[PDB]
């Protein structure tokens, strides 16, 4: 019932995500010189370095907030892709599956710990 445990669990999951080749297009903000129309489609850019920095700055209060930003990385890729067969979009789907598989216990344990705190 450790209410703080999610933070290190999220740091470790972000480390695994950075080791993965599929995260390379998402490690830093999308390069606007490479994709000049990006901000015409995407209102809120997000990337894994921004997530890691927000976490390290102590600017996430819960793993739900981190999970919303990570999910925004994937929804931005789905919105920007010209095709469901695109290389970078296909990488985002594999990364999303891996993230969701691993974040589920982090969220469950955190929510359980908060319920125990108010039992
Ligand atoms: Br990194 C990563 C991303 C996507 N799928 C993965 N599957 C297994 C292990 C690491 C993975
Ligand atoms: Br092309 C493409 C497809 C999907 N997501 C993308 N995100 C960033 C840069 C290029 C992308």
Curated annotation (Swiss-Prot):
This is PH-interacting protein. It is linked to Chung-Jansen syndrome: An autosomal dominant disorder characterized by developmental delay, intellectual disability, autistic features, anxiety, hypotonia, obesity, and dysmorphic features. The modification Phosphothreonine is found at residue 44. The gene is PHIP. Expressed in myeloma and epidermoid carcinoma cell lines. Probable regulator of the insulin and insulin-like growth factor signaling pathways. Stimulates cell proliferation through regulation of cyclin transcription and has an anti-apoptotic activity through AKT1 phosphorylation and activation. Plays a role in the regulation of cell morphology and cytoskeletal organization. The modification Phosphoserine is found at residue 90. It is found in: Nucleus. Interacts with IRS1 and IRS2. Interacts (via bromo domain) with acetylated lysine residues on histone H1.4, histone H3 and H4 (in vitro). Residues 1-106 form the Bromo domain. It comes from the Eukaryota.
